[PDB]
Amino acid sequence: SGFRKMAFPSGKVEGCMVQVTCGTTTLNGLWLDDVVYCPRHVICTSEDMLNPNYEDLLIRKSNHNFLVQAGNVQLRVIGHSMQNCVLKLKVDTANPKTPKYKFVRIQPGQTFSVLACYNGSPSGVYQCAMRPNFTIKGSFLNGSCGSVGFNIDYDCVSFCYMHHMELPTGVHAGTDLEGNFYGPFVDRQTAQAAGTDTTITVNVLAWLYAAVINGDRWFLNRFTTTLNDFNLVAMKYNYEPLTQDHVDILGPLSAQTGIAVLDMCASLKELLQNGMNGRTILGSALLEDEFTPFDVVRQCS
Amino acid sequence: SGFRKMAFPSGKVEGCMVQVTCGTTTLNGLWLDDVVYCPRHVICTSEDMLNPNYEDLLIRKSNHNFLVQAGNVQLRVIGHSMQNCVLKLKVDTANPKTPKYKFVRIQPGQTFSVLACYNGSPSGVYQCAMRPNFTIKGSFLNGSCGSVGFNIDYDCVSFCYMHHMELPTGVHAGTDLEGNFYGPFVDRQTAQAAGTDTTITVNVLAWLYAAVINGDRWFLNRFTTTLNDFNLVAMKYNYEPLTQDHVDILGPLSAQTGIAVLDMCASLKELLQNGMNGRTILGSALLEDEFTPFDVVRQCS
Numbered sequence: 001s002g003f004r005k006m007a008f009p010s011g012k013v014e015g016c017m018v019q020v021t022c023g024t025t026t027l028n029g030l031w032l033d034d035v036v037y038c039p040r041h042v043i044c045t046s047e048d049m050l051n052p053n054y055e056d057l058l059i060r061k062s063n064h065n066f067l068v069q070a071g072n073v074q075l076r077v078i079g080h081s082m083q084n085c086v087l088k089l090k091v092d093t094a095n096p097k098t099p100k101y102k103f104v105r106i107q108p109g110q111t112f113s114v115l116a117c118y119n120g121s122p123s124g125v126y127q128c129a130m131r132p133n134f135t136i137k138g139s140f141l142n143g144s145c146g147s148v149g150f151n152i153d154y155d156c157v158s159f160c161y162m163h164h165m166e167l168p169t170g171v172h173a174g175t176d177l178e179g180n181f182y183g184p185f186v187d188r189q190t191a192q193a194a195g196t197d198t199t200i201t202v203n204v205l206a207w208l209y210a211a212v213i214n215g216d217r218w219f220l221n222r223f224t225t226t227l228n229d230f231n232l233v234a235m236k237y238n239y240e241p242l243t244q245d246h247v248d249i250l251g252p253l254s255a256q257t258g259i260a261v262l263d264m265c266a267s268l269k270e271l272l273q274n275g276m277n278g279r280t281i282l283g284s285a286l287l288e289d290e291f292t293p294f295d296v297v298r299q300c301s
Numbered sequence: 302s303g304f305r306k307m308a309f310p311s312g313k314v315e316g317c318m319v320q321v322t323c324g325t326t327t328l329n330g331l332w333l334d335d336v337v338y339c340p341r342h343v344i345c346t347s348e349d350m351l352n353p354n355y356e357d358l359l360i361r362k363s364n365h366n367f368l369v370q371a372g373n374v375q376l377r378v379i380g381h382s383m384q385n386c387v388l389k390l391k392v393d394t395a396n397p398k399t400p401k402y403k404f405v406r407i408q409p410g411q412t413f414s415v416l417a418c419y420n421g422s423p424s425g426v427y428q429c430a431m432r433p434n435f436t437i438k439g440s441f442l443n444g445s446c447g448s449v450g451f452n453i454d455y456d457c458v459s460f461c462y463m464h465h466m467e468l469p470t471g472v473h474a475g476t477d478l479e480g481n482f483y484g485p486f487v488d489r490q491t492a493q494a495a496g497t498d499t500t501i502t503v504n505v506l507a508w509l510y511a512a513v514i515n516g517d518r519w520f521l522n523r524f525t526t527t528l529n530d531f532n533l534v535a536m537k538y539n540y541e542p543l544t545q546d547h548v549d550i551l552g553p554l555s556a557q558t559g560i561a562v563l564d565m566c567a568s569l570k571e572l573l574q575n576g577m578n579g580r581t582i583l584g585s586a587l588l589e590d591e592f593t594p595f596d597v598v599r600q601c602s
């Protein structure tokens with residue numbers, strides 16, 4: 001028993017991280033087979049921050065303008081191209097530690113592991129969720145650009161996030177591995193701000209199911225609710241709408257615990273009105289929204 | 302910016318994990334140089350566990366009683382002995398992936414990373430503190446015995462923990478890598494309970510520094526206090542005594558923020574007496590005590 005924010009083992013991603021330099025700028029890159037992937041903003045200088053013309057800046061570069069380094073080894077670049085907001089440096093060696101892998105774009109609510117890295121060297125690993133406003137709440141300092149997010153299901157690494165920038169409220173924005181941004185953001189230093197965030201309702205419900213599995217029952221009640229009345233209440237606390245999709249997805253946890261989805265919704269409505277009155281759930285005094293239904297089954301018996 | 306609970310990158314340890322079987326029991330082992338380390342309880346039947354004599358059960362075993370699998374490869378056991386509550390299985394092959402390592406014993410209040418494993422295969426990684434009552438709050442299911450805890454300093458892995466059991470309240474107990482238990486526990490099926498736990502004061506203060514550095518400041522105040530006055534409030538609230546050594550360790554952070562420890566104690570005093578007056582600090586409605594000063598300095602600089 002127990003329940004914790006748990007990241008994937010990071011070893012397979014570790015053997016892929018390198019350092020990319022261009023001009024006076026150093027950040028991280030991702031070395032798979034004979035390609036290194038990194039943010040395209042590595043090629044910008046001082047007055048290329050507001051309105052860069054990336055196609056114009058790239059055509060002016062030669063291969064020897066890019067210094068790639070894996071530990072002590074210097075890799076040698078033999079070609080370059082751009083795909084959306086990601087740069088692809090072709091190199092003369094294939095990475096011997098390349099795992100089985102794939103690129104996947106995730107949706108709001110999904111979780112993944114981040115491997116934070118500086119100068120091509122891993123620093124730590126933690127779990128994040130894609131927020132409804134298309135940002136993540138991470139821990140990134142100067143030099144962390146090019147760090148990646150991933151899942152590992154059944155020995156295959158799925159890459160889903162590459163870090164590009166921090167927004168004014170202290171939250172983080174990036175792309176998939178095909179270089180398309182999550183949300184309406186752009187790789188320019190013009191003023192930009194995230195939309196107001198909301199709580200991920202389906203995830204909170206999954207976590208209440210986890211608490212019941214781990215032996216907590218104090219917050220249940222004898223009521224139920226319609227799906228519509230639930231949504232009218234929950235939106236007044238900045239919770240995301242629960243859909244029939246989400247109801248279907250909680251079917252297995254429902255069946256294991258014998259508490260119907262709409263009964264558990266009634267419990268959530270009550271918690272929102274009352275708070276916790278000194279108690280905790282799985283060691284938390286807030287309602288947690290960064291564990292998916294799939295994360296709950298994986299971690300629990 | 303941002304602040305997250307973060308494990309060390311786990312790859313140097315992932316390369317050391319194997320499966321060990323004796324009769325019908327399977328669990329995890331640690332393969333370093335030409336030895337495999339695992340809990341001595343692997344040799345026990347259900348009935349043995351009620352009241353085991355390990356001296357006698359062990360002399361009755363031989364090398365071929367133990368099956369050791371690294372991936373799909375059998376390791377041959379050529380010797381066997383016991384050190385305290387850990388079994389040492391000598392094998393014919395040195396681990397080509399052995400990192401630079403040593404065995405260390407940690408103190409209460411110190412943190413470390415856990416690599417949860419099942420049938421010799423790494424499953425997840427998370428951070429824990431050694432509680433004052435010598436348990437940890439982990440997440441473990443059957444088959445997790447022999448999973449290990451560790452820190453990394455430069456290139457050197459310091460191994461500090463091996464998982465042995467779950468207590469009735471859902472918390473976890475284990476040994477160092479020399480087989481000595483943390484806390485007053487024994488490796489048998491008998492009645493055992495965790496002592497009443499206490500809050501780690503110096504860590505709570507570290508986390509208040511992290512909050513301030515990340516722009517959370519509401520809980521600050523004009524006041525200061527004394528070690529003596531504070532300690533008498535702490536004793537009442539089941540907080541550990543704060544010592545002059547703790548005050549010194551927090552030195553870098555006092556400097557960085559301009560808030561002195563005894564100033565921060567006044568803030569903490571009010572929070573214990575009054576409450577959080579609703580709010581949250583770094584996304585928590587609890588006072589968090591599982592981050593050390595080093596953890597905070599590491600992450601934030």
Ligand SMILES: c1ccc(-n2cnnn2)cc1
Nearest residue numbers: 141142143144145164165
């Ligand atoms: C704009 C956005 C992000 C960055 N950085 C990424 N890693 N360090 N800095 C630099 C300029």
Ligand SMILES: [Cl-]
Nearest residue numbers: 105106107110
């Ligand atoms: Cl998804």
Ligand SMILES: [Cl-]
Nearest residue numbers: 272273274275
């Ligand atoms: Cl309220």
